Every structure is written in structure tokens, then in C-alpha cells.
Design a protein around this ligand. Structure first.
Ligand SMILES: Nc1ncnc2c1ncn2[C@H]1C[C@H](O)[C@@H](COP(=O)(O)NP(=O)(O)OP(=O)(O)O)O1
Ligand SMILES: Nc1ncnc2c1ncn2[C@H]1C[C@H](O)[C@@H](COP(=O)(O)NP(=O)(O)OP(=O)(O)O)O1
Ligand SMILES: Nc1ncnc2c1ncn2[C@H]1C[C@H](O)[C@@H](COP(=O)(O)NP(=O)(O)OP(=O)(O)O)O1
Ligand SMILES: Nc1ncnc2c1ncn2[C@H]1C[C@H](O)[C@@H](COP(=O)(O)NP(=O)(O)OP(=O)(O)O)O1
Ligand SMILES: [Fe+3]
Ligand SMILES: [Fe+3]
Ligand SMILES: [Fe+3]
Ligand SMILES: [Fe+3]
Ligand SMILES: [Mg+2]
Ligand SMILES: [Mg+2]
Ligand SMILES: [Mg+2]
Ligand SMILES: [Mg+2]
Ligand SMILES: [Mg+2]
Ligand SMILES: [Mg+2]
Ligand SMILES: [Mg+2]
Ligand SMILES: [Mg+2]
Ligand SMILES: [Mg+2]
Lengths: 480, 478, 479, 478
């Protein structure tokens, strides 16, 4: 059991302490090799073959860089070797709970398959971590390196998911800044983002403009309303606004690419159709479904992107409907993108209303004669909440800064102290509509229903509206 | 025959022999001795690159864009002659830059000769004329199918704009050709694409705009009776990002507060040297640094080397200028005091710039001060940051097409894209510096500065509470 | 109907003609999304997650760049749009025959599982291409775009695998240069190498020093012994030696990494143990095994890296032995590397002798006290043939060059006309030894047998010889 | 008084201790901003605008990374903060002695201008460092941060230029510290790692050596009673590749035939200017270009600027020098005729270089020729290509360790690595050029050249059968 060096193309040669190597070399960690980081995005950006495994190594590594850098510059914080290891382990294990195709599984499939549960991959990560530890004899290995499992397991879990006065048990207040490394609940400025920006960009073929290494150099811990927090140099404020701008830009260009999303939707659909028939063996030989494997970590261990191919290659007549959806993916007979719009004014589309939207689009009465009627079943309506990670809030209002002439003194910097060219709002909704019927006449009709629906709901005019529905767009006074 | 040249940004590029003849002149080779980012090199040490290599890059990209349009749309009748003219314009577009590039036309000439309205682009047109005439290039143009009466004019118009349909070099059915090198309608041009990529490579800041993607999706469509370059509808987000990147490169690098003060110091040294340096132009006439812009033979010999000519001089008359450049090398720079912006609808007008150091020195901070500072001790640098068209959204001046009707041009408004985009497209930054560098002068300069910000109802400096703790409580709006 | 653009991180935005899009959007092509380019190398270099799919797009694209560039510079060659499409399709389809974990499948598994057949992934690519065309109605689509399927399918196949006097039917000798793009049988200078150099490096985190774009700019077709062939500028000769040096260096640093190879070996072992029990359905419902799916393209279509996980997640008691080997991979209880050596002198280890080598290692008699005796079954001996792509030959002796003052005149350039610092030989063998028993005492013993065996065979001294076997290495004066 | 961070595109954000900042902010250091790293190479590779200044920052930084990494992994070595600063200073100052156009100045000009002296830029760096320290009051600043100037100045100089135990600055138990900046035992030093990475970034050729990996695997072990830097055994292949890369960068870039002829032309102009240019040194004494190396105050003012000072001069005495530089700017370069190498055991010695143009002109090609050419018309450039230690394999002078005994040093021979490695480690290339550029002179120059190769039993030029079809059949060995 000695330290390993591993060559990562994003971070270079990184060092893994032998405790981390023991954690990595388990079935529960290695599972992340079989889950694509960007899910259906690989079917649009062919360089995006990367898996959660390598992202997880990167987050472990960066978490270690940030806590080491803080410890070197500020010995008064009393960051111990034990703290450093716990922060690295949390970085390493933070995404253990992702399911097949990553964001698809907790963003689309589980909410549709099991609308009663409130589940996130982060909860999965905590449960999977527990199962990793318990089934591989890791507690004695922790003790061998000076960790205290009652306290430190709890600390690690709290870093990943948040709390399970001062709500944490794993560390006291004098170590609060340690909870801001892996997953920053105050403002989202965390090393998870820095790894995925750099790694996704390298694979996508879109270039990263955020400099995380610069941020680490300028980061300090300062007292802010009587808690010790990570603060940035004042002159980095512009770079932080740019960080969130980059995040939003990566969601627009890649993560919410309209076809990447429809592939995720189709896979979700196939999983919903397969769910009654696929059996996954968990603890004590009990049988779980795709939707219930989240309840038993032994089952969930075996639930990866492989399930796609298990369905695609099946012959069972019961899986026929699921299998045909995946066949449609491989022949590229995808549901067709019709367009994009947004609400106007103070209108917000609520999650309770999502299910009713296909019916609304099909009920629009385009004032043009139509040969084809389309039914609700024929439309998909995907509502995407785009923000700066804190709903309507400006995350930079929850960051603290310091100045070169008083480096222990935290200050606030407001938006108006930076620039007038920044966003005026921090949240918005995009609505994408697609049609399951792909023939030319159905598609012409779907465009008319769509643009009419936008007019009826007082949504923004689709960008191509005048071209795809020339007879509809003149009817709307606010569009001309 | 063609030459190949290896550029680190674009790879191996081909130069037509007419371009090679233009490059191999004193007028073009001059660009090897003018830093792209001027004083920026004194802050970002990778930014050693010169205007020469930027110019090759713009020539190359100009050629890629016009070739791509011609291949996709043969009905436009883009000729080999048109391609060469566009390449030449890209190659020669920055011939007019002076020592330290933006410093020379942005700071020095306006101060040295406030009566003239000069730009490097005007310089590029005059330098091009002088390059052609003094190196026998007109017959070589003819040899390759160009018509110099028409094409020289076309080339110049591409660089500087017009010298109803205001252009003589090409008719309306070729208006798109004027949108490649320097796009007067919206600023979306290959010059930006080269400098984004090249500056980033050298600065150590990463480029996020994909120019190659833009070229693939570009088409020419009819818009209000002219053939113009349009982009695919779905690229609109990427164009907003393009201008966001431009603004971000100005914030991080080009307007870095110390890069600018170095540019200011060099400008100061040039103003102090201007009466004493003689540069010989055409017919043996004698020019100064500030007048060499009137004669391209003189201007040919004015490059960044003038910095070292002053620094190494022994002439007592250049003592004052020389001492400023010595201060740069010891890093005894004028000191940054801080940054602020106007509030509300307030605009600082160019006529008022000269009065601002006096205003800062006239502030009466209610604080005990060892030193009184005079107007001459402050520099107040006002920077106009925008999306290239003052208050306007340049995306309102772009045309788009949709996949289902690719010959039909459309407009896309800001509200059709995103609510997270900027609400304004122009703003002003105000940096204040002090020429007196000792600890007590600097403490005082901070008090005058923050008090001035309070008095003018400008934004609170980011470090205001720390540098002037007794001043910032006075102002209710902070 | 129309062209698609696709964004690749290595080549940027590439354009795909609609005929290529029809070929790509088939089960037979999309299969390549589930086959890792570097196989077991992903278990060593975590950035090497890339699959054969994206490599195939890249080779298609570069094949098109090279043939377009030749056509633009030399209209007299009469390169047609039809030729361009055929070269693109060949580049796109060249690796359709790879199996699970790529080089593992044709380099290790098939040779062990079916030693009677002479099979390569390239043969697989030809058969898979035939099956792709026939089962997706591609022939009429080819006709729609000006291709002539009798001739052009044959041309495409020949570009991939070679011939199936002038031995080719798809194109004549005045177009011989077209066979030098995707897979160059004369000297190995082909666009396949250029894509994988660039793509592997980007993912591995090792940097590429070969500039393929420069090579394309300087490439011309010239007459050489009555065939039209691709020639390089004279002054590029250095860069071509560097190309093969880079290839060799990527094999040393990554592709033949000792642990990447042992993982490939372990997976192969698990597949051999699973082979009797896994059923893959092929044409007419017939059942194939892992080792026989190469005989039926409908079965082979469904044979990808997924088989690893099918074994790993199985519960069938019959798959227990295969499953346990894959569990050993996941816990990193790997067969242990003992060391590396090479033959000396004139000695060449022949393929017929590979199987006898573990027995030789176990028969060595190290004069050292050992608690554990090891048997032949405990050693793995992996022999790797490292060369410049043409066994003992210098591939640069099979390249033609031209000079700036006579660009249509082909010439030869010998090694002595370039540099005295170049390699003296172009082939060698590396011998890696591993031990299947992983405890510290077995490993100590394995090192003594290994170093003694090297001494006995007069192989090169292992680099760490003095440290791992201090009592053995003094016996050998020449060490 | 506080640390500075600087953004370099090769190494990222690097930290500079305030003592380093004081050294950098002097005229003697800042001088390096005006000397191109690759000299005339910029006139072939237009991305290669980089100067010695940024290379020097990089070497300072890497020197610091290597010594820090050794200290972190091996606390028993007792590397102090003082040792780290001294190694950084040496890295930073190691190239202070370069002259105009870098390798051109000490490789071509000084040897020709002053054949009696044995001068290297490294000697210059030591003298320039001494002058930097003494004229900027640096010794008290060193003391303020824990350095001992009697000892540490000596240590710093020994690291730059070299020397029982021959060093005075540090004892044997710290010998490894002398292997960071300039490694005299085998050449594996951080100077190479910076220039590989930085040159590649600017040239547009990609670097394949991973220096960071080497740093991770580097350890100090006892070797024949000295503590030395050793590499992991399995890195041996990577080290052979390192020297292969060095050779490959010399072939592609640094010894590019046209880059060298430009260096030669500039050298020629400097030789013609040398009697007439005056550079003021200490106490107002006057130096020449060739003598400015004797006085650091003069040498401080000798940079690439001298090129433009000559080009723009009007003095009649500089006419010949000026005309050569004009020929560079119009691209009327001496023409490359070809390349060959000696055969067998033959080595061309430096004493014989001057006689070679005469030999080429004395060859008697049995061919009808329009022009007879004289010795003065040919340039013969002889280049020594090696792995940095003449005929020796530098890997024979490296020590390694194994994972199972990391404190135990071992040797690894070439046969333990690969049969595909080089069989020799040194060779000579001979390039011939002609000063007469017309077609008939050039035809003749090719005939003399190929005949000369045949007469001396040199290798057949690669294009020999094409440029001299009547000459190459005479030689049986071809
Ligand atoms: N020459 C090279 N260049 C770059 N990366 C390389 C490399 N060789 C390997 N890597 C990558 C592969 C891995 O990501 C990492 C480590 O590979 P090893 O350093 O080969 N270490 P291992 O555990 O095999 O040997 P041991 O136990 O004897 O120390 O570097
Ligand atoms: N091996 C190499 N690899 C990469 N870039 C290179 C290179 N060699 C040169 N460059 C860069 C340097 C230049 O930017 C460009 C062209 O250099 P040449 O191809 O050397 N052309 P020249 O005009 O000397 O030879 P001729 O007239 O005989 O064809 O490539
Ligand atoms: N903003 C962006 N920047 C870079 N690459 C991008 C990108 N957006 C997509 N890609 C990549 C993803 C793909 O690899 C490629 C094409 O994506 P689309 O241009 O979005 N084309 P699609 O076929 O969806 O829309 P249509 O049929 O309406 O033209 O570019
Ligand atoms: N946003 C940015 N991104 C990347 N590099 C940047 C940068 N801004 C500056 N640089 C580069 C330029 C330099 O190479 C380096 C340091 O520039 P500053 O951090 O601005 N430091 P200074 O001394 O001006 O301010 P103070 O004294 O208040 O700390 O970073
Ligand atoms: Fe994550
Ligand atoms: Fe420009
Ligand atoms: Fe391939
Ligand atoms: Fe150096
Ligand atoms: Mg997560
Ligand atoms: Mg998060
Ligand atoms: Mg301009
Ligand atoms: Mg412009
Ligand atoms: Mg502006
Ligand atoms: Mg293949
Ligand atoms: Mg091959
Ligand atoms: Mg040196
Ligand atoms: Mg050296």
C-alpha cells in the first residue's frame, strides 16, 4: 500500500495517497467508469466519451489542492493531514450516486418513475459511500492513517450532501471553510465545477475561459459574520461573474443541447417502458427494478450505462416497446425538434404543470387550414430552468472578498461596483417542443401548433417563427 | 510560386506570390517592431507578439471566409481576383499602427495633436498606398488578374470604409465582401477572430469563441437590396458570447490598470521627446514623432525602437523623456489609487477629461493629511467600454437565416434569446493614479480619490472601506 | 437529404456528406461507440475513455482532406467527387471489425481461442462493411450520389484490407495513390496513424509532435516505376523518421504499458473462461460464442465492451471463474509485473516458441534460498514485436521524395543522406514476465527465476536487476 | 516587500518572492526584454517573437519547482529557504549574458570579431549578475531575507557557469543543487525544459517531453560519495526522448537553413559595423559591439536595437553594414545551395572552417559553366549536432533508482533500453550558400558544390541527381 501517481490529461500527474487508492479500487468506485459524464450528450458531441470515474479523480485532486494551498498560506487555520484526507475522499466520492447517463437518471427518469420520492444523486453518493466503506473493510484502513471513522465518515458525507446555530457534526465552526471545497452550499463556487469546466471542454471541443488555478492562488480564509470562510481577492470579482457566465454558456451550447436532451428523453422513455420487466439482484438476492435499485446499493452497484445495451440487445417480447425506442436512437430516427420559446413577464411555469403542456400544444387552434390533427401523445415539452445556481439570486452577493492592504478583512462587492454590462436577472426558463411524428406533413403541422401555442400563452416569438409559421406570426400584435 | 508559413495560431498557411511581394517590403516588415499589446507586455510576459504576425493571420482568415462563401454559393460569382483583394486587405489592414499600437492612436496622438482626427486605419490606407508605389506592386497586381484603378480603391475601402451606395471598389451585389476584414455594420470580422485567438495564446488566458464554427455556418442572403453575410439562427448565442469575450479580454488584459499606466508613461516620455527627435520623410522634410503620421516615408521608420532610442540616448534635451523610461525599468511606476464608475445616466464627456485631475485635487477629505497634492500629481484615465457600437446592441445589426429557408434573412431580438444578457452595451471606467509614490502621498491620494468619488456620486471603490475608512461612512448611498 | 456538421475536439467542425451520414447511422457503425480505442489502457490512463467511433470519424475526415488536397493541387490526376466519397467511406469504415477492447481482441483473444484461423480486425471491417451495406439498403443511396457499387464497394474494401501484375480491381494503376490514404501498404504513412496520434495524445495526456497538416501541404503525386504515388518534399524526410519515432514512443509509453497489457491479458483470460457459456444470437437465430461471433456479422454486431459487464454482473454459476477474474481487475489484484528483458545478438524468439517460455522461466535454477517453488502455470511471458511497421525494414526506404526544382521527378533518399543519429535497426522484441501469484513471497521468488532465466538465455540485464536479485546478478560478468 | 504573482502562458501563475522582484526590476534584467530568444529564427517562424526575459522567468520558476519538490519528498536533505532562493536567483539570472540575437552573438559574431578571446554568454551572465547586484544595492536585500552574500553570490555564479570537490558555494552534501539550472554532468536541466515548452508554443511545433513527470519522479541518492539527482529507472526511455526532441528542435527550427543565413547576414553586418559604432560604458569609455562584452555598463545597452540603429543609420561608414540589413528586409538573402555531411571518421575542425569556401571555389566540375565563382561568393556553415556532450551518450552519466530500493542509485546502459536508439551521438552538417543570386550563378554554385562533395568523399546531397545530373554519375559510392 504505497502512493500512486496517475496521469490525467486535464490536471497532469496527480498523487493519490494509499487510503484513496484503497477507496478507488472497489467495485463501487470503479462503477463510475461505466457512466458517461454527459449522458446523451455523447450522441451529439462525439468527443464526450468521458465517464464519471475520471471526473471524480479530478475533483478529489482539486479538493486536495485547494485545502493544501489554504494550509500552506495560513498555518493558523490548523488544517491537519486528517482534514486534507477527508476533503480528498469527499471530492473523490462526491458523485458515486450518479445513475445511468448521469443527469438523465436523477433529472428525468426517477422523477417520472417514482414521483413520490425526493431523490438526488447526492443522496445516492452518501448511501453508496456507506456501502463502499462497509463492504470493503475501509474503516480499519482509515484508522491506520489517523482518521476517526465515527467523526470522519460523517464529515465526508456532510461535505457531499450538506447537513444530515451550527448544523454540522463532522467538524466544528472553526473548520467551516472545509465545507466549501467540494460542494459549496453558500454560493456554488466549488472544485466540482472547476473540474467539469476543464474536462468537459477538453472533450467537447469547446474551450474553457475560467482559470481555476488563478482562483486558488488568490483564495484566503477570512472571518465573515463570525464564521471562517473562503474569500477571494477583490480584483477576482469579474472573473467570478465570468465563471457563472461560462457555466450558463456550457449549458446552452452543450449540456442542454436540444438533441442531447431529446436523446436523454428517449432513453428515459425506454427505461420507463422497460422498468416493469428488468430485474436487478440486490442484497440477500432480492429483486429490484431500474427505478427501485436506488433503494439497495448492492443492486445499484450493477446499474450503469450497460442497461442501455441490455435493453437494445434483448429478445424478450415484453421489452419490445423499450427496445424499439433505443433502435430509433441508433438509426437516428429521433423525435424532431420543433422549437424553443420562453415565458414573458412574471410568468413562471411550475413543475406541477409540466405534464399538462403537451396537451396544451395539441389543443392550440392554428388559424390556417390543417390536413393533419396531432394528439397530446405526439408532443414532448421540455422545460429547462437556467440559472446561476441559486434560483433568482446573484451568487456573487454570497461571496466575500479581501483587499491587498488588509488581507484578513472580508468585504462585500455589489454588482454596481463591478459593471453595468452584467446580467439584470439570474434565472430564466427555456421551453423546447418536439414532435414524435417525423414525416414532413406532421412536422409542418407541429410547427403551426407550436407557434400558435407560443402566441396564445404570450411567450417569446420563436427565432425562426416567421419562416416555419408565416401565416401564424402576423396574428400577434407584440411580435411585429 | 506560393510560400508556406508556419503560424502557431493557424498552422501552415499559404501565401500567394503577390502577397509575398507585399510582405517583403520595408513598409510591411516594420510591423515586426510594433507590439500588438504595447504596454501589456510589461504585465503579461507572454505578450511579446507583434503586428506582423497578426497581419498574416488576418490575411489568412479573410481568405478562408471569402473562399468558404464562394464554395458554398457559386451563384455569388466570387472571383479569384476578389479573393486576392480580400486577402491583401486583411494583410494590410493594420499597416498604420504606431509604436505600442493602441497607445499611439488612443493616447499619444490625441494629446500631441488635439486638432486632428487620426486613426491607425487612416494610417493603414496611406501606408498601403506608399507600399504599393514605392515597391512597384501595381504591375504585379496586373500580372495576377487585378485591376489596380478599381482594386486599390476596393482594398482601401475594406480597411477604412467609404473614402445610396457609397463604395466605388465593388457594387452592391458584392457588398458582403466589405464585411470580412472590418465590418462597419456590426463589428463581426476576421480581425477580431485572429486577435482573440492570438492574444489568448500569448497572454495565457483561454479563448472561448469558435471562429471556424462561425465560418461553416455563414451564408450570403439578400437584406434590404444588398447581398450580406448572415449567420445561422442558432449561432445567435455564440455572437452574444463573442462580444462578451471581447469585453472580458479588455477587462482582464487590454485595459489592465498597470498595462495602461505603462502606456501612459511611454506616452508621457514621447510628449517630452517630441520637440527633439527628427525623422526624415519624403523630399528630405523633417518630421517629429507626432507629425510622422503625415508622411509615410517618415512613419515607416517609427516603431517601438523609438523607446530604446530614447532610453539609450545621451542628448541632454532628451533627459526628461529618458528619466520617465528609466522609471519604467526600475518599476517606479505612477501608482494605481483605484477605479470607479459613473452612476445612473451620467456620462463623462471627452471635453471634461482634462479638468478631472483638478477636481480630484480639489476634493476636501475631512481627514488629517501630511501632504497636499496638486492637480499635476493625478492621472485620471477614462475608458469607454462597449460592444463596439457605443450604446447599441450589435446583434440588432446582424442578419440570420433558418435551416428550412436558407436564402431568407431574418432578425432576432435580444428577448428572443435570453433574459440573462446585458441590459446596456456601454459603460465608463475611471482609473486614478498618483505620480507621487511615497507612503504619505499615497495615503493622501487615496483620501482625495474616495472623497472625489463621493462628491461626484460615482460607485464606491471596491476597496473603499479599507483605503479610506473615515471617508466611506459620509455617503448614504454606500 | 443534406450535409451535417459535427464537432470533434481533435479536428474541429467536420462536414459529413449525406451518404456518410446514412452509413454512420446504422447499428453496425454505432457499435463503435462501445469499443474503447485503447482497451485496457483506460485502466491505466483515465483520460483514454475514447472509443473507435470517434477515431473512425476522424480517419474519414482526414482521408477526405488528403485526397481533396491532392486533387486541388494536381487536376491532371482526375480525382473525381466519386473518388473522394469512396476514400471518405473507407476511412470511416476502416475499423468496423474491431472487437471488444480493440487490440486485445485480435492480438490476444482470437489467436488463443482459435489458433487455426488467420484473422485480423481488417478482415472483420470488410465483412462488417458488407453486412452494413446489405442490411441497411445503402447500395441505392450510393447510386443516387454517383457511385457505382460493383466497382466502388470493392475499392472501399481494398483500401481497408489490401488485395482481396496490378492486384487491385477497384481502381487502376493510374490511381494507385488512392490506396495510400487510409492504409498504406507500401510504407505505413497513412491518415489512420495521423488521427490516432493526435486523438490518443489528447486523451492520454502525452503530447503529439507530428504535424500531419504540414505533411499534407507538401504531398504530391509523382510517377515512380510506372505507378502514380504519393511523394513528400525532400526536406520532410526528417519529419518522416520522426513520425515513426513517435509511433514507437507511443507504443512504449502507452499502448504497451505493462499494466495496460496485463489488464488486456486478464480480460482475455476471463473471456476464454466465459466462452463456453455465453450465447450471442446471429443470423437465422443461430447461436455463437465470443470466439465464433467473428463468423457471423449479425452476432458480431452485438459483441462490444459490454460483454465485460455482462460477465461481471452475471449470476450464472458457470460464469463464476470468468467473473472472478474480472473481480480481480476491479479490486486491482492484478497479475504482478516481474520485469522486462530483450534478446541479444542474432536471437529472435519465434511465435511457435511463445507457449514454451513460462516453462523455461520455471525451470531456471537460481542459486538462492526460496520458500516457494513456482510452476510454469504461474508465469505469463508476453513477447512484443516493436518495429517501424515493416518488420526489419526501414519504411523510409519505401518512400519517394521530390525536390523544389523538379517537382514531378521522384527520388530516393537513404538513411546516410539524412543523419548518423537515426536508428541502426528497425525491429526488436520486448519480453515482459508476470507472476499470477500475488503475495510478496511468490513475487520475490518470481524475480529470482526471472533474472536467472535472463542470465541463462543471455538476455539483457533487467534495469532493476541488481536490486530485485542482488544474489543473482554477480554471476554474470558482462552485467 | 510582498510576493508578486505573474501569469506566464507556459507555466501559469507563478509566484515571485520579493527578493526576486528586486532583481528583476533593474535595467540589467529588463534588458532581456529586447533580445529575441531565437534570433534570426523570428524571420522564418513568425510566432517566435519571444525574448530572453520570459525564458528567464520560466527557468527561475522551474528551478524553484524542482528544488521544492526535492525538499518536500526528502526532508532529510535539509533544503533551506535560503537554498531555494539561491537556486531561483540562479535560474532567473542564468541568461543575463546573452547578446543581440542570442546564439548568433556568442556562436557567430564574437568568435569572428575577436578570435583571440574564449567568451560565452554564460561568462557574460556571471559578469552581468555582479554588475546587477553592485549597482542596485541588492546585497543588503539578500541579507534581509536570510541569504549570506559572500557565500551565496559565489553559489549562484557557480550554478550558472560551473566551478576533489571544486565548488565553494555549497558543500558535497548539497551537490544536487548544482544540477538544477545548468547540469554539467549530463545536461538534464530546467533550462532545457523551459525552452522546449516555450519555443514550441511560439514556433507552432508541439513539445513531446513531459518535464512535470520528470520532476515527480526525481530523487536525490548517494552516488560515489555525492548526493545527486536521480530519475526512476522506467523514465530512462523518456530521457532518450528528451535528447531526441532537442535534436529534432535543432533540425526543424534552430538550425533552419534560412534562419541560419539570416543570423549569418546579421553577423556580417555587425562585422562591417564594428569599427564604427560607439557604445558608452563605465567612466564614459567607448566600446565597440565586439568589446562591449568587457564592460557591463556598455553591454547593458547592447540589444537587438543595434539592428535597427544600423538599418536606419546615415553615416557613410555604415553603408556596407546597412546594405546587408536592407537585403534582409527585401528578402534578397544569400541563397541556399545544399547540405552534406562528412563520411567515415572525418571531422572538420574549427581551424579549417575559414578555408572551406576556397575549397568549394577550387573544385573543377567537368561541366560547361557561364560564370566562374570566387571563394568570396560562397558561405560554408558547419554545424555540430550532438546530445550535448560531444561523442558521449549523456544517459551514461545519469543515475537511476528502482521502486523497491529508492535510496540506491544504479546505472542503465543503452543495450538495457532499446536497439532502436542512436548508434552515435554526434555528427556534422555542412550547408553551402551562394552570395550571387542570379540563375546562372546559382546553377554554377550547385555544380561546384556537388563536385566538392564528390572530391571530399562527403554524402551525396539529397537533391544531387536533380541539381547536378552530370556530376553525380562520376562517384561510384553514390
Ligand atoms: N512515459 C509516460 N509518459 C506519460 N505518462 C505516462 C508514461 N508512462 C506511464 N504514464 C502514465 C500511466 C499512469 O496514468 C501514470 C503512471 O504510470 P507508471 O508511471 O508507468 N506507474 P506504474 O504503476 O505502472 O509503475 P510502478 O508501480 O513500477 O511505479 O502515468
Ligand atoms: N520541420 C518543420 N516542422 C514544422 N514547422 C516547420 C518545419 N520546418 C520549417 N517550419 C516552418 C518555418 C516556416 O514558417 C515554414 C516554411 O519553412 P520551410 O518548409 O522550411 N520552407 P523554406 O522556404 O525554407 O524551404 P523551400 O523554399 O526550400 O521550400 O515552416
Ligand atoms: N455552440 C456550440 N459550439 C460548439 N460546438 C457546438 C455548439 N453547438 C453544438 N455544437 C456541436 C455539436 C455537434 O457536434 C455539432 C453540430 O451541432 P448543431 O450545430 O447544434 N447542429 P444540429 O444538427 O443540432 O442542428 P440543425 O440540424 O438545426 O442544424 O456542433
Ligand atoms: N483576470 C486575469 N486572468 C488572467 N491573468 C490575469 C488576469 N488579470 C491579470 N492577469 C495577469 C497579469 C499578470 O501577469 C498577473 C498579475 O496581475 P494582477 O493579478 O492584476 N496583479 P497586480 O500586481 O496588477 O495587482 P495587485 O498589485 O493589486 O495585486 O496576472
Ligand atoms: Fe461532480
Ligand atoms: Fe487588426
Ligand atoms: Fe484505425
Ligand atoms: Fe537559457
Ligand atoms: Mg454531483
Ligand atoms: Mg454543485
Ligand atoms: Mg486595426
Ligand atoms: Mg474593428
Ligand atoms: Mg472599446
Ligand atoms: Mg485498423
Ligand atoms: Mg496501419
Ligand atoms: Mg544559457
Ligand atoms: Mg545548457
Amino acid at each position: 500500500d504505497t502512493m500512486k501517481v496517475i496521469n490525467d490529461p486535464i490536471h497532469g500527474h496527480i498523487e493519490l495517497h494509499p487510503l484513496l487508492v484503497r477507496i478507488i479500487d472497489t467495485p463501487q468506485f470503479q462503477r463510475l467508469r461505466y457512466i458517461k459524464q454527459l449522458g446523451g450528450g455523447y450522441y451529439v458531441f462525439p468527443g464526450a466519451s468521458h465517464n464519471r470515474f475520471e471526473h471524480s479523480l479530478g475533483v478529489g485532486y482539486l479538493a486536495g489542492c485547494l485545502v493544501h494551498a489554504l494550509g500552506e498560506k495560513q498555518p493558523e487555520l490548523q488544517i491537519s493531514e486528517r482534514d486534507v484526507l477527508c476533503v480528498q475522499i469527499a471530492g473523490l466520492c462526491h458523485d458515486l450516486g450518479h445513475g445511468p447517463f448521469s443527469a438523465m437518471f436523477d433529472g428525468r427518469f426517477i422523477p417520472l418513475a417514482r414521483p413520490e420520492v425526493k431523490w438526488t444523486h447526492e443522496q445516492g453518493s452518501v448511501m453508496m459511500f456507506e456501502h463502499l466503506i462497509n463492504s470493503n473493510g475501509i474503516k480499519p484502513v482509515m484508522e491506520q492513517y489517523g482518521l476517526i471513522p465515527e467523526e470522519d465518515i460523517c464529515f465526508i458525507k456532510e461535505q457531499i450532501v450538506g447537513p444530515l446555530l451550527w448544523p454540522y457534526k463532522g467538524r466544528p465552526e472553526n473548520k467551516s471553510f472545509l465545507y466549501e471545497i467540494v460542494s459549496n452550499k453558500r454560493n456554488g463556487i466549488d472544485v466540482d465545477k472547476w473540474d467539469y469546466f476543464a474536462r468537459d471542454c477538453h472533450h467537447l471541443g469547446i474551450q474553457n475561459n475560467f482559470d481555476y488555478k488563478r482562483f486558488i492562488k488568490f483564495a484566503r480564509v477570512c472571518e465573515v459574520d463570525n464564521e471562517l470562510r473562503i474569500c477571494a481577492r477583490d480584483k477576482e470579482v469579474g472573473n467570478l461573474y465570468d465563471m457563472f457566465h461560462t457555466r450558463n454558456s456550457l449549458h446552452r451550447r452543450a449540456y442542454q443541447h436540444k438533441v442531447g436532451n431529446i436523446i436523454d428523453t428517449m432513453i428515459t422513455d425506454a427505461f420507463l417502458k422497460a422498468d416493469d420487466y428488468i430485474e436487478i439482484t440486490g442484497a440477500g438476492g432480492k429483486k429490484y427494478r431500474i427505478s427501485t435499485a436506488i433503494d439497495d446499493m448492492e443492486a445499484y452497484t450493477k446499474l450503469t450505462d450497460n442497461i442501455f445495451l441490455e435493453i437494445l440487445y434483448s429478445t424478450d417480447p415484453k421489452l419490445k416497446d423499450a427496445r424499439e425506442i433505443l433502435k430509433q436512437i441508433e438509426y437516428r430516427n429521433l423525435f424532431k425538434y420543433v422549437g424553443e420559446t420562453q415565458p414573458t413577464g412574471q410568468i413562471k411555469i411550475k413543475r406541477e404543470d409540466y405534464e399538462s403542456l403537451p396537451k396544451e400544444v395539441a389543443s392550440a387552434k392554428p388559424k390556417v387550414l390543417l390536413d393533419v390533427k396531432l394528439k397530446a401523445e405526439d408532443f414532448i415539452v421540455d422545460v429547462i430552468n437556467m440559472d446561476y445556481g441559486m434560483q433568482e439570486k446573484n451568487p456573487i452577493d454570497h461571496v466575500s472578498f479581501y483587499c491587498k492592504t488588509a488581507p484578513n478583512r472580508a468585504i462585500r462587492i455589489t454588482k454596481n461596483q463591478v459593471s453595468q454590462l452584467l446580467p439584470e436577472k439570474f434565472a430564466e426558463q427555456l421551453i423546447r417542443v418536439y414532435c414524435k411524428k417525423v414525416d414532413r406533413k406532421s412536422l409542418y403541422a407541429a410547427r403551426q401548433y407550436f407557434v400558435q401555442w407560443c402566441a396564445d400563452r404570450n411567450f417569446t416569438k420563436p427565432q425562426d417563427g416567421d419562416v416555419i409559421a408565416p401565416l401564424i406570426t402576423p396574428q400577434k400584435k407584440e411580435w411585429n
